[PDB]
Amino acid sequence: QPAHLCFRSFVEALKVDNDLVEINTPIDPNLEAAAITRRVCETNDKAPLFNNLIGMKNGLFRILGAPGSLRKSSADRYGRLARHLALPPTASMREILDKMLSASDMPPIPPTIVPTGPCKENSLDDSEFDLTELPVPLIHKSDGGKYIQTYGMHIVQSPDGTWTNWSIARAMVHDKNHLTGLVIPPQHIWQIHQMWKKEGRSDVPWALAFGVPPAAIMASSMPIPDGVTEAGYVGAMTGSSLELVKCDTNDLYVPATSEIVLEGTLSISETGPEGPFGEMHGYIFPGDTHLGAKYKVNRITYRNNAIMPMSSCGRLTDETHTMIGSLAAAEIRKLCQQNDLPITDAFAPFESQVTWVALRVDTEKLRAMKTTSEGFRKRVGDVVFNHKAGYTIHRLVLVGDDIDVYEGKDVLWAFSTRCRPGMDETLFEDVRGFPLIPYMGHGNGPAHRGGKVVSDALMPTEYTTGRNWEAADFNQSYPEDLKQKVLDNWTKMGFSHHHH
Amino acid sequence: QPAHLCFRSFVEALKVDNDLVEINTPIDPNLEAAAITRRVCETNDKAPLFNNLIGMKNGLFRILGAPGSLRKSSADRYGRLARHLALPPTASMREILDKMLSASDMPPIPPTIVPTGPCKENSLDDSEFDLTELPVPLIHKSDGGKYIQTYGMHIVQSPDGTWTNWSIARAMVHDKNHLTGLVIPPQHIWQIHQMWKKEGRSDVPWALAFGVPPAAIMASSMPIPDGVTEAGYVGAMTGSSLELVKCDTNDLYVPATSEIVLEGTLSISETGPEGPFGEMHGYIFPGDTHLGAKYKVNRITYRNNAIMPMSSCGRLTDETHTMIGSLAAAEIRKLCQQNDLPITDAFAPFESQVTWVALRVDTEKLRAMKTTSEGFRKRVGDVVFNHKAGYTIHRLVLVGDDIDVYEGKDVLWAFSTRCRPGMDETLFEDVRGFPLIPYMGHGNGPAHRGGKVVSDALMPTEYTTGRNWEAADFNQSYPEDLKQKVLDNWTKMGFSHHHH
Numbered sequence A, B: 001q002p003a004h005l006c007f008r009s010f011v012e013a014l015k016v017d018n019d020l021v022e023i024n025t026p027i028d029p030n031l032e033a034a035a036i037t038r039r040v041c042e043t044n045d046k047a048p049l050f051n052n053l054i055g056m057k058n059g060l061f062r063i064l065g066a067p068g069s070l071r072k073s074s075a076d077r078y079g080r081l082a083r084h085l086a087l088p089p090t091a092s093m094r095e096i097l098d099k100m101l102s103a104s105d106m107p108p109i110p111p112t113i114v115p116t117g118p119c120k121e122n123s124l125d126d127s128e129f130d131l132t133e134l135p136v137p138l139i140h141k142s143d144g145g146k147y148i149q150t151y152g153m154h155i156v157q158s159p160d161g162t163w164t165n166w167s168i169a170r171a172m173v174h175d176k177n178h179l180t181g182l183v184i185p186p187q188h189i190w191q192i193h194q195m196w197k198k199e200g201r202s203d204v205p206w207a208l209a210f211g212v213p214p215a216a217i218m219a220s221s222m223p224i225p226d227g228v229t230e231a232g233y234v235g236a237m238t239g240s241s242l243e244l245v246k247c248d249t250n251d252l253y254v255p256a257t258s259e260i261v262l263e264g265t266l267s268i269s270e271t272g273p274e275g276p277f278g279e280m281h282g283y284i285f286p287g288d289t290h291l292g293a294k295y296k297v298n299r300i301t302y303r304n305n306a307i308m309p310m311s312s313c314g315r316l317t318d319e320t321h322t323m324i325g326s327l328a329a330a331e332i333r334k335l336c337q338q339n340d341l342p343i344t345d346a347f348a349p350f351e352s353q354v355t356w357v358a359l360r361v362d363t364e365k366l367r368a369m370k371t372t373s374e375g376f377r378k379r380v381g382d383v384v385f386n387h388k389a390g391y392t393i394h395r396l397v398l399v400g401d402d403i404d405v406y407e408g409k410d411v412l413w414a415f416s417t418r419c420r421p422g423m424d425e426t427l428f429e430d431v432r433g434f435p436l437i438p439y440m441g442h443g444n445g446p447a448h449r450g451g452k453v454v455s456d457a458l459m460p461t462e463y464t465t466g467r468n469w470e471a472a473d474f475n476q477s478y479p480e481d482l483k484q485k486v487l488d489n490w491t492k493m494g495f496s497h498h499h500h
């Protein structure tokens, strides 16, 4: 099966790309695997595959770290994400995000049910496993638990059967047969949980699949619309119906090639201690345990020689930046366009710790709107900050057509030079806030409300008659012929490759 | 003479450092010299020395571009600035700024008058030069004039003789014997101009010296206090009295080794067209000409084989960033400390286009103040934004002791994750604003007032009981022994020099 449709083939693709380091000597899941992975993420090194994990027994489990992190080279910077999607390894972020949005105006391609698959090669019932006996990583030294779940897909279905959601949400081992995890509004796992709670009759049938098809984990990380079954979206995006197999203990369906599957229930009544966890913004607050949702595990199935993917998240750059930020930005771009706003591109700059999204404006269309900064900022913020796709984003930066929003240096330049603090901004205090940002949940104000802003880095004439400056840069402040002459004579004169 | 005391020796130092490219074939001062220099600045390449400038006659002049720009290597990134100051080329920015502040609590060392020097090797009277006939550069294609003056030092003295100021301010050729330039409040050239205007009796005696002692051009770029004669400050900083020679046509004194000296007057009545100019924030607004100050040139003196330094300023990184921003930040650090504020370090991040200054707080001292964010922010902003040292800076970012303010990535991280937009900020609308920032002079509000903010990126417990987090990074989220093990085994396992 293709790499974007089979995790085991994805691992092979990373090997072939010279983007994998296989570590065949013993590595401790208590911190060491995650420390190596952290170092990888901070230096854009090759992904580590831990083939000899202290505590692995009966095939459970190897670990792949940094599955969606960056490569060092500029030319294939996003190559791991491209390998999730069947794209060339040199694909740009625009091309990756366009691929992730492509299914949004296609008919879904529903999944195909098959009778078995690799994920059924081994099984452990309720009498045969103990989650505390598996080589679950301690990812950060102050974490409140061993976070088994950093890159698997939770599967839950609405009570009426019409919507099956796939999503990433963290979870840690609570005891031999339970996890605790985050289940928070407005996330779809929470929305579906609330449907079951209102019905009041049973716990939520649940499965958690690790090492799923890479294209599926990408959609799991993206805020596609309410009510949309990710499996059919991924089907449409990839042009192929995904092959799923039924769980043994419930009637949910998991990818046939999943490395590891947990089957059980998400409680509608029970909670347990959850966190703290070293999180996407770069912090852990030791001892901030809170009650989280509680999952009961009834069965484990797994591939021979199963591999657990792991995100050692925190400071730049890991999956929580490359995937959460970029995929939210993609959805926000679409949302703006569907609300008749003249946005061409959106990206969450890494420099912002993916708390900002820069929105590139088609300023020809803006001019035809005959509007003003105050009005336009309000319109944009109302659309984005009132929608789930905007949940994680606290600052929107509006920029004109000269800015490449995928280049953080240019976003920072535009923000710093074109947006007058205060006057060119609109604050939003009556919107949902993202509590995980330190200045929210550990800050001076309400954890769950406000703290958002639209920062207008459009210059005044961009609303009226057109750009009225040239940059004081090599590109814009010298004629073409002269620039070329300079470039052609650069090494002759004594001054100093794309792939590298 | 030493490199920090003699520009001609500074050029030799750049050569010896393998930090100079000598271009001995003809180069056009109409754009080509500045385009090469711009490319250098955008790529941190070696400084260009244009020895064969089309239009050079009778020794006037060669050009050195990028005299204070960055080197590519991290180890000697700031080596050109270190060579202005007799510091090792690996000096850190903290060490450079400490050197520039060192004279602030030393007795001045007044200059020594000598009877002659190299700057008297050649002269041209009022009948022998024409400024329009010199190889003055056109620096940016849309500039409103040929900017002769981008890295020389204006010399003006108070009417009472007690204060002689040295400063950089731009100026362009107006006609055969006049320049126009910026002379704007609160700058000391403006303050002194206003003294002469109130006296009303004569134009201001003036000199403009190019290729001055490097230590002197650094002080010329720094907002040392009102009333302080830069020559004595530089004397104290360097431990040596600077040697000056009298002008021929007035009683001002210029550095003996100056490459080129213009002598004349700054009018108290006349103006002429000035600008536009491709400026430090990265923009030019073609056609925004304004009236500027008008200088009359009565005499030129110059060294044999004179060299004119030139800043091809604009987008990152050039002298307007490395010197304006950093030196303002240094002065702001001192100002805060003299106002009993617990600031240890200050830097203007390049990413901010040097419009922000990050202030590192000694949080032990902060805790002892038993204050709050609102109160502290107000105090800091009142001190800085009401002072000339704060003129160019529109955003102050307060950070705790874990942040290295000289590392823009860490400042951006702290800003983005610790400062809640709105609530953790105080806007200042009744302070002097810096009109050259596009969002000021070409923005939606008053060009000269407001648009400033203090952004508090201190977390709440930093005011009370102490930091309550650990970073989710390799450094902080793993024990020492494990980190070292990982590092020691890094290349063994298969993963990937300081000078490079």
Ligand SMILES: Cc1cc2c3c(c1C)C(C)(C)C[C@@H](O)N3c1c(nc(O)[nH]c1=O)N2C[C@H](O)[C@H](O)[C@H](O)COP(=O)(O)O
Residues within 6 Å of the ligand: A149, A150, A151, A165, A166, A167, A168, A169, A170, A171, A182, A183, A184, A186, A187, A188, A189, A220, A221, A222, A223, A224, A279, A280, A311, A313, A319, A320, A323, A324
């Ligand atoms: C890629 C990725 C996504 C997430 C997470 C991680 C990774 C690697 C963790 C390392 C596990 C850290 C964690 O905080 N985490 C996480 C999370 N969403 C939550 O509700 N809860 C979480 O604990 N998302 C984000 C969500 O996956 C997206 O917001 C997605 O949009 C949700 O799907 P849906 O609700 O839109 O269907």
Ligand SMILES: Cc1cc2c3c(c1C)C(C)(C)C[C@@H](O)N3c1c(nc(O)[nH]c1=O)N2C[C@H](O)[C@H](O)[C@H](O)COP(=O)(O)O
Residues within 6 Å of the ligand: B149, B150, B151, B165, B166, B167, B168, B169, B170, B171, B182, B183, B184, B186, B187, B188, B189, B220, B221, B222, B223, B224, B279, B280, B311, B313, B319, B320, B323, B324
């Ligand atoms: C290093 C450097 C400094 C400056 C400038 C440049 C360089 C390279 C130009 C390339 C020429 C561009 C220009 O905008 N420019 C400039 C300027 N100050 C002005 O009042 N006017 C100017 O036109 N400063 C800044 C001043 O030099 C400092 O603010 C200094 O503090 C002033 O001295 P003082 O008034 O404190 O004595």
Ligand SMILES: O=C(O)/C(F)=C/c1ccccc1
Residues within 6 Å of the ligand: A170, A182, A187, A277, A278, A279, A280, A281, A313, A320, A324, A392, A436
């Ligand atoms: O645990 C975390 O670091 C995390 F990113 C959680 C999260 C992300 C997006 C949306 C909701 C929660």
Ligand SMILES: O=C(O)/C(F)=C/c1ccccc1
Residues within 6 Å of the ligand: B170, B182, B187, B277, B278, B279, B280, B281, B313, B320, B324, B392, B436
């Ligand atoms: O012309 C310029 O680009 C410029 F930076 C001017 C300036 C800088 C600092 C203070 C005052 C003016």
Ligand SMILES: [K+]
Residues within 6 Å of the ligand: A166, A167, A168, A219, A220, A221, A222, A223, A224, A230
């Ligand atoms: K999803």
Ligand SMILES: [K+]
Residues within 6 Å of the ligand: A418, A419, A420, A424, A456, A457, A458, A459, A460, B439
């Ligand atoms: K604006």
Ligand SMILES: [K+]
Residues within 6 Å of the ligand: B166, B167, B168, B219, B220, B221, B222, B223, B224, B230
């Ligand atoms: K000065």
Ligand SMILES: [K+]
Residues within 6 Å of the ligand: A439, B418, B419, B420, B424, B456, B457, B458, B459, B460
């Ligand atoms: K704060």
Ligand SMILES: [Mn+2]
Residues within 6 Å of the ligand: A165, A166, A167, A188, A223, A224, A225, A228, A230
């Ligand atoms: Mn969903």
Ligand SMILES: [Mn+2]
Residues within 6 Å of the ligand: B165, B166, B167, B188, B223, B224, B225, B228, B230
């Ligand atoms: Mn001064």
